[PDB]
Design an enzyme around this catalytic site. Structure first.
Site, PDB file in Angstrom:
ATOM      1  N   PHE A  38       0.964  -1.176   0.140  1.00 32.90           N
ATOM      2  CA  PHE A  38       0.017   0.024   0.079  1.00 32.90           C
ATOM      3  C   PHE A  38       0.948   1.056  -0.082  1.00 32.90           C
ATOM      4  O   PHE A  38       1.805   1.294   0.970  1.00 32.90           O
ATOM      5  CB  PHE A  38      -0.793  -0.206   1.229  1.00 32.90           C
ATOM      6  CG  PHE A  38      -2.046   0.909   1.229  1.00 32.90           C
ATOM      7  CD1 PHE A  38      -1.868   2.258   1.681  1.00 32.90           C
ATOM      8  CD2 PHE A  38      -2.991   0.352   0.867  1.00 32.90           C
ATOM      9  CE1 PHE A  38      -2.706   3.113   1.852  1.00 32.90           C
ATOM     10  CE2 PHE A  38      -4.525   1.455   0.668  1.00 32.90           C
ATOM     11  CZ  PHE A  38      -4.053   2.650   1.362  1.00 32.90           C
ATOM     12  N   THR A  74      -1.654   1.314  -4.968  1.00 31.22           N
ATOM     13  CA  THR A  74      -0.953  -0.038  -4.386  1.00 31.22           C
ATOM     14  C   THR A  74      -0.120  -0.808  -5.578  1.00 31.22           C
ATOM     15  O   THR A  74       0.030  -0.191  -6.656  1.00 31.22           O
ATOM     16  CB  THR A  74      -2.087  -1.094  -4.046  1.00 31.22           C
ATOM     17  OG1 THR A  74      -2.904  -1.351  -5.216  1.00 31.22           O
ATOM     18  CG2 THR A  74      -2.949  -0.533  -3.106  1.00 31.22           C
ATOM     19  N   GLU A  75       0.774  -1.648  -5.108  1.00 35.80           N
ATOM     20  CA  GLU A  75       1.579  -2.532  -5.938  1.00 35.80           C
ATOM     21  C   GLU A  75       0.586  -3.027  -6.806  1.00 35.80           C
ATOM     22  O   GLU A  75      -0.601  -3.408  -6.711  1.00 35.80           O
ATOM     23  CB  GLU A  75       2.110  -3.539  -5.039  1.00 35.80           C
ATOM     24  CG  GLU A  75       2.552  -4.774  -5.624  1.00 35.80           C
ATOM     25  CD  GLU A  75       3.573  -5.660  -4.565  1.00 35.80           C
ATOM     26  OE1 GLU A  75       3.170  -5.733  -3.698  1.00 35.80           O
ATOM     27  OE2 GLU A  75       4.372  -6.460  -5.056  1.00 35.80           O
ATOM     28  N   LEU A  76       1.206  -3.304  -8.089  1.00 38.14           N
ATOM     29  CA  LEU A  76       0.451  -3.798  -9.224  1.00 38.14           C
ATOM     30  C   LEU A  76       0.699  -5.292  -9.276  1.00 38.14           C
ATOM     31  O   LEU A  76       1.925  -5.830  -9.658  1.00 38.14           O
ATOM     32  CB  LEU A  76       0.906  -3.162 -10.561  1.00 38.14           C
ATOM     33  CG  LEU A  76       0.229  -3.919 -11.816  1.00 38.14           C
ATOM     34  CD1 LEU A  76      -1.136  -3.522 -11.628  1.00 38.14           C
ATOM     35  CD2 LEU A  76       0.913  -2.846 -12.735  1.00 38.14           C
ATOM     36  N   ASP A  96      -6.306  -6.014  -1.204  1.00 42.36           N
ATOM     37  CA  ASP A  96      -7.554  -5.120  -0.860  1.00 42.36           C
ATOM     38  C   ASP A  96      -7.375  -4.548   0.541  1.00 42.36           C
ATOM     39  O   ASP A  96      -8.823  -4.498   1.170  1.00 42.36           O
ATOM     40  CB  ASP A  96      -8.877  -5.865  -1.262  1.00 42.36           C
ATOM     41  CG  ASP A  96      -8.905  -6.079  -2.876  1.00 42.36           C
ATOM     42  OD1 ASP A  96      -8.379  -5.504  -3.489  1.00 42.36           O
ATOM     43  OD2 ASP A  96     -10.061  -6.641  -3.019  1.00 42.36           O
TER      44      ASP A  96
END
Length: 245
Positions: A64, A77-79, A144
């Protein structure tokens, strides 16, 4: 191409959708500090959560980066680029035990890290469709993170309580899903029946289609009705199944 950026110059927003949804739309972003592609997610219209989450990193948690209200809510966020466990159970139809063990241990370490933060972070919405894979021969990350603030629900959540063990209960159902390739309580249809089954301690029917007895054991003690009897993540990680390999 590039259409927006964060308040400092850090994150750049691109006009190329990488994901949609009834509340959340996801765009290609760039972290201009590191030149790494990230996920710029816009939610349709979080104080203390962003605080926790911004300074969080762990090998089994989706990074995050930041969040702010834009003037929609933005989460960077990270992909993740390899899909989720739920798509993994569609692709391969089953999950074999070396992988089940490894990935379930990883979920537990990620949960344990969340719960040991000060204050504890409770995921509150863990499911196979928000657990992301690093690659085909890789590890898992819980995603999430920021979103539970707007079945895998422990019975006590219906009376709007929750505590750490609600994640254990959802892990149970995740493992159950990974050991069965089906949505728990799919013998039910509506929420009201699942509510009745769960709050009388009546397990998913799919529970009986778990082939490994040890795994069945684990799922059993994650999903107990009274929460104080549920395994702790300490208990779970010391079970033979996770201590073996």
């Amino acid at each position: 191409k590039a259409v927006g950026m964060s308040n400092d110059g850090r994150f750049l927003k691109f006009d190329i959708e990488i994901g949609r949804g009834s509340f959340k739309t996801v765009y290609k972003g760039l972290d201009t500090e590191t030149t790494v592609e990230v996920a710029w997610c816009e939610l349709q219209d979080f104080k203390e959560e962003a605080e926790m989450l911004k300074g969080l990193q762990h090998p089994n948690i989706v990074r995050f980066y930041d969040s702010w209200e834009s003037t929609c809510i933005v989460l960077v966020t990270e992909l993740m680029t390899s899909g989720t466990l739920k798509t993994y159970l569609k692709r391969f139809k089953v999950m074999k035990i070396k992988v089940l063990r490894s990935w379930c241990r990883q979920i537990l370490k990620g949960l344990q890290f969340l719960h040991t933060r000060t204050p504890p972070i409770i995921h509150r919405d863990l499911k196979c469709d928000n657990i992301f894979i690093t690659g085909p021969t890789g590890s898992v990350k819980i995603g999430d993170l920021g979103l539970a603030t707007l079945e895998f629900m422990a019975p006590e959540m219906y009376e709007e309580k929750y505590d750490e063990s609600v994640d254990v209960y959802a892990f149970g159902m995740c493992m159950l899903e990974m050991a069965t390739s089906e949505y728990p309580y799919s013998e039910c249809q509506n929420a009201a029946q699942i509510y009745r089954r769960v709050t009388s301690g009546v397990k998913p029917a799919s529970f009986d289609k778990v082939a490994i007895p040890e795994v069945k054991e684990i799922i059993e003690g994650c999903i107990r009705q009274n929460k104080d009897e549920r395994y702790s993540i300490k208990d779970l990680l010391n079970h033979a199944f996770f201590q073996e390999e």
